[PDB]
Design a protein around this nucleic acid. Structure first.
Lengths: 251, 473, 473, 251
DNA sequence: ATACAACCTACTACCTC
RNA sequence: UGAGGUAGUAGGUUGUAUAG
DNA sequence: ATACAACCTACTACCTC
RNA sequence: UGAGGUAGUAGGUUGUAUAG
């Protein structure tokens, strides 16, 4: 019997209701929902979010006269189980909405903790600045180190999924800086440096760094939270999903 | 804590009806299935390049030792492994003069230079095949290394050395093997650094392709490819169920014609009467319009499945009792209805999707080693993860370098049994005749279908391509 | 009393650089020139016919003794003579069901039945070549004997057994070998009586093709053809002068198109750099209008000779110093001027006419035996008679049966030396790779040109035919 | 040194002159020269023959008033050597005329000696009747014999040629009869019988029969003659041309 | 045509068997 | 392309949703 | 288009290596 | 067509010559 540590963080809890607020005219069309403080997706004339009705007042002063009874809040447990499906919203496209909300919440939460950001081809990764940590070692495993003239940093990227479980998959990456603060602009240089650094990163060099970064993102001893709204929080476990294999081996 | 099952390592069959997990160890001790009396080799290239091939073939004549025999078994020599005479005497040489090979190389246009370079070799190969009495099993084509620098897409030619067809691929290998298909000539392309490399040195002085530790496996793969191309049976599967055709589909882009046209190529594997294993291409390439469809129309799906079923019947006599279609891409309802219309009542059709995209990685609790290969997390009766790339004790390490990504196996269509599907894909990952490795990270139907597609998207003027793999791999 | 000179018997070369007049004795003791590790044989035909081929190949595995060893040397077995492994194990079998072979046979129209019979075999051969991993050097095609009765011109089908394409020859063999030329597949056609014949019996009970005395030479010729078709060098000439290309022209009729169109085919022989002997077809068939012209127009003569000279230069580097064109027919001034226009200043062009029509017969004064082979009556510096068919002591008898007709060799064009011309034609009469005999009665250039013409007048849709003889003989 | 017997009979002598008589109107056009007693070929308005001017009087009563001075007689020695060539006649077509004359003379001479005739595809052959010879054996070698129910006969065919020498080539054949007088009408039957009979006819079985037939055709001890005309005769040696070879062998 | 999620191929670079 | 593996780029499609 | 001589191929039959 | 050899059929062309 062998226990394996995955890169999937369990999503411990969800807000009781997924809300669709009928902002309509109160929401100007020529406005991006990304500048909203809390995650939200413009679906039809509804704003789909886990937040409260008046959490977007600062960005939307015209929503001060919104009526709460126009919300079509949904019992998220039905969404995840699959019970909810109708003409207004489909279970396939209602679970995709929550994934977008969770992804945007993860991005905003990473922005909140002041971790430097590097854009990839498709995703975005969050690395740590030289000097942000105490000597750049969280827990007992170093996250930021040196390699010739390049300061290397450990970065992670998050992506919420609901198919096997409600989980958050994290991908690990290595990034490089010329001075420890500014990122090298050459994609080829970064790729070559990442390959060189990963040449000698074995199982426990990746696993420990991933778990250390996750524990850094933690807010208590059991999980961290993504801020759905002023009152709603999604709790993502800082302990990744563990798998138990019935066969193992030794050196 | 989620349960994680483990599929037993499939066993392949060798001479005298023997079994072994490792292809290299099975060939080194028990030998290949059939008897090839000898391999008559044709060598085309520069006279300087002929010396390299002669020296390397003399090298592989003798047993070869690598750095760590436990991780990578040593090479016991060609004639000891494949009991077949592949000598350096009796090779038919076609010289390519350096002036000729340089005249077309120093060209601004990559497509024209690639076409002319391919023609310079294939014309000599075709003339030797037709108008000469010598018999050759495999035509070993040696190319210089500056050619490899300036004969493929996105190869910016240096300005100081510029001296001086667009319906073909700008890549040498794909066009080369595409234009020889009418004549059915098995060929093997060798870079001058892939062969004797100690002459090729960088600024530091070490060889750029330093294989000082890995001569044994280099020779293993080279010899296995040479034996397969000459008409040999290296090994065969032993766990194939009766009445089961498999088929695997891969889609490729074609830039030659407007719209990528999404050519679809299939590779068919099944069992023959007696105990023989049939594994060939199923190539009627069914081109798909639309830029990113990657799905087959009802007419082309019907044509593909009817061709596969007819090919099975023509060799066994009755239709398959169960078919397991593989694909990198998910099947939609239209093409599956098209497939089921052709399929008879008795045959069971199963559509399986195989992908590496899912970001799952199991890091073990302690120890600088990755997970065992063969572990499977059955998500549900229709979906699972399977670690085709992982640790196996016999090779002394894991097949990957970093933490590997598992294969996501989904029964997209049909019913199937998930454990049986994972048992067959793991078996399919063994029969890679192009590479003499322990096992492949992807089922062989998908990989050889991808190779067939890569070669046939290079030539627009192909017609009724051969179904034997030796003309592509 | 007229003088009668005698040309010395030419010597052919064998392995280890040995010489012998007899091809059979040279092969039996010294072996062939090159090393073929093995012959992988494909056998297509009825399952009943497969047994006959297997039994006959087992027969020729062991040494074979004929009635009189002095006249016809015994056969020492295939592997002892040609040091090549041609076993009965490892043959690739393609069954032809008796129902299929009968369905098309019982047809009123000879052309359609011949086309369908040829297709029934060639489709299987092509499919095996393309879509199968087995490697075959020669495809041995076995046909029944009623087929041989009802598959060729002027074969009146019996009325009681009638049950049920015209752009092709009504003969099975010529069309069969014409339609396989695109794929370059060496094939050997065997009647079921040519193979094990003791089963086939007439009314008296004796075998109709009774070979009780001649098993040895039958096996000799069969084995020599099989070795040549697989890519082997049985023997070579040793008296070829440097810088001498030969070329031989033969005209054939084509009934498919209106007007026989008098297709002309040539076979080119010369010496290569070092000591190798080059002997291949020179096939660009240049069709001649008019019903009985048998002469080449200036354009086609120029094309033929330019092709031959270019083929010589492409292998040696410089033009031939002397060319000896042979032909069954006399050259007229038009085609000779056309030939000389292409010919450079250094090259000497000679046009020689070879015919059997002249009614000369030398009966010796006493003794029931004919004249010695090699005797020549030089009529004058431009014309002679040469006895290519005659007595030679080593074979213990004469090559003919009745009193033979001598070859009339005339220098129709050019200057030449008559004794040198008779010295080369006698040498040319040796290299018959289709027949393992002491010597041929006609120069091999004319005979193989005739075979090429016979095969290429069967298929109208040929294009760039191969120049290697193994695809025709 | 070995002596060989060929099938070529030397033409010992020719008439001194090859004549072209200007018969013209005296020769009706709608008349075949084959019914003429002596060989003749209609060339232009001339009749080419070795005969005398009035040798054709019986078949041509209208030639009784022919003038001898109109003949353009030629010195045959010049023809054979090659000297004679002009616009009237060419040396290539003047030697072909003599071959036709010699061939027709051979046919007529064979007709004169009463030898039975069998037509081949191209040539004609002259065989001997059962009972024509004394027991059917000329010299000491039999010419006509039996084989099952078929009476077999030895036949020869003649053809004059001038290229190597002025010679007469003779080809040997075997013919078969059902009763000894009438010929079998089946070509296949005759071919099969000829092959069966020649299966055991070796060198001296052919040579002796050929020489015996030639000696039968002889008129004296050294030659025979073809009747060119009332006064001109071509003498063909009954001894064939002999060839001497410097190499031989023994059993 | 813009945003997203969940699915797709083609290409270059390094490392390793 | 002797091979397999792991990256990082680049582009694309489908499904929705609101706008031109 | 008939006759000839001197040159041509396509086909069937038997015999022999 | 495993081969080579020897027949016998059948047709043809060229070159002349005279006639339709």
């Amino acid at each position: 019997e062998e226990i394996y540590d995955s890169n999937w963080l369990s999503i411990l809890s969800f807000p009781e209701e997924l809300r669709f607020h009928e902002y309509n005219w109160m929401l100007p069309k020529r406005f991006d929902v990304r500048e909203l403080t809390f995650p939200a997706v413009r679906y039809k004339n509804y704003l789909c979010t886990f937040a409260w009705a008046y959490d977007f007042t600062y960005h939307l002063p015209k929503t001060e006269t919104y009526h709460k009874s126009k919300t079509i809040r949904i019992p998220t447990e039905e969404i995840l189980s699959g019970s909810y499906d109708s003409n207004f919203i489909r279970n396939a496209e209602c679970k995709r909405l929550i994934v977008q909300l969770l992804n945007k919440a993860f991005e905003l939460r990473m922005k909140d903790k002041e971790v430097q950001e590097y854009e990839m081809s498709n995703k975005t990764a969050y690395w740590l600045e030289k000097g942000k940590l105490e000597k750049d070692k969280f827990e007992k495993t170093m996250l930021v180190g040196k390699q010739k003239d390049k300061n290397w940093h450990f970065a992670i990227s998050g992506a919420s999924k609901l198919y096997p479980f409600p989980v958050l998959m994290i991908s690990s990456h290595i990034f490089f800086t010329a001075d420890g603060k500014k990122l090298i602009d050459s994609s080829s240089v970064q790729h070559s440096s990442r390959r060189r650094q990963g040449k000698n990163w074995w199982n426990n060099t990746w696993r420990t760094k991933l778990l250390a970064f996750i524990k850094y993102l933690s807010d208590d001893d059991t999980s961290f939270y993504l801020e759905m709204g002023s009152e709603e929080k999604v709790f993502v476990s800082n302990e990744p999903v563990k798998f138990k294999g019935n066969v193992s081996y030794n050196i | 804590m989620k349960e994680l099952i483990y599929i037993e390592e499939p066993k392949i069959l060798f001479a005298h009806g023997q079994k072994c997990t490792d292809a290299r160890d099975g060939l080194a001790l028990f030998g290949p299935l059939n008897n090839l009396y000898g391999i008559k080799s044709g060598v085309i290239g520069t006279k300087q390049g002929l010396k390299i091939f002669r020296d390397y073939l003399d090298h592989i004549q003798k047993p070869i030792y690598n750095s760590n025999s436990i991780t990578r078994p040593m090479f016991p020599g060609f004639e000891a492994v494949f009991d077949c005479k592949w000598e350096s005497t009796g090779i038919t040489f076609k010289e390519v003069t350096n002036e000729d090979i340089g005249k077309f190389l120093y060209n601004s246009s990559t497509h024209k230079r690639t076409y002319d370079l391919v023609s310079l070799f294939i014309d000599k190969i075709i003339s030797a095949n037709k108008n000469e009495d010598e018999n050759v099993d495999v035509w070993f084509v040696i190319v210089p290394d500056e050619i490899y620098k300036y004969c493929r897409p996105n190869s910016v030619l240096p300005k100081e050395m510029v001296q001086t067809t667009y319906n073909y691929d700008a890549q040498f290998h794909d066009q080369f093997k595409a234009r020889l298909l009418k004549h059915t000539i098995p060929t093997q392309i060798f870079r001058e650094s892939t062969l004797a490399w100690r002459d090729f040195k960088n600024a530091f002085g070490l060889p750029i392709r330093d294989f000082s530790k890995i001569e044994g496996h280099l020779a293993w793969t080279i010899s296995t490819a040479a034996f397969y191309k000459a008409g040999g049976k290296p090994w065969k599967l032993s766990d194939v169920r009766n009445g089961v055709c498999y088929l695997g589909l891969v889609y490729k882009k074609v830039e030659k014609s407007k719209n990528p046209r999404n050519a679809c190529c299939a590779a068919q594997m099944f069992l023959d009467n007696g105990d023989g294993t049939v594994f060939k291409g199923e190539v009627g390439p069914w081109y798909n319009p639309k830029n990113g469809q990657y799905h087959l129309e009802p007419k082309e799906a019907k044509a593909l499945l009817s061709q596969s079923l007819q090919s099975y019947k023509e060799q066994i006599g009755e239709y398959p009792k169960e078919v397991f279609i593989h694909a990198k891409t998910r099947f939609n309802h239209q093409e599956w209805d098209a497939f089921l219309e052709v399929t008879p009542k008795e045959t069971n059709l199963v559509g399986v999707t195989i992908s590496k995209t899912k970001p799952l990685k199991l890091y073990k609790t302690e120890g600088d080693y990755t997970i065992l290969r063969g572990n499977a997390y059955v998500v549900n009766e229709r979906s699972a993860f399977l670690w085709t790339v992982g640790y196996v004790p016999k090779i002394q390490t894991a097949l990957s370098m970093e933490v590997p990504n598992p294969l996501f196996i989904e029964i997209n269509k049909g019913e199937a049994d998930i454990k049986q599907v994972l048992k067959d894909i793991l078996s399919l990952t063994k029969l890679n005749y192009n590479a003499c490795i322990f096992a492949d990270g992807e089922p062989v139907t998908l990989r050889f279908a991808d190779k067939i597609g890569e070669i046939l998207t290079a030539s627009t003027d192909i017609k009724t391509p051969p179904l034997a793999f030796k003309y592509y791999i």
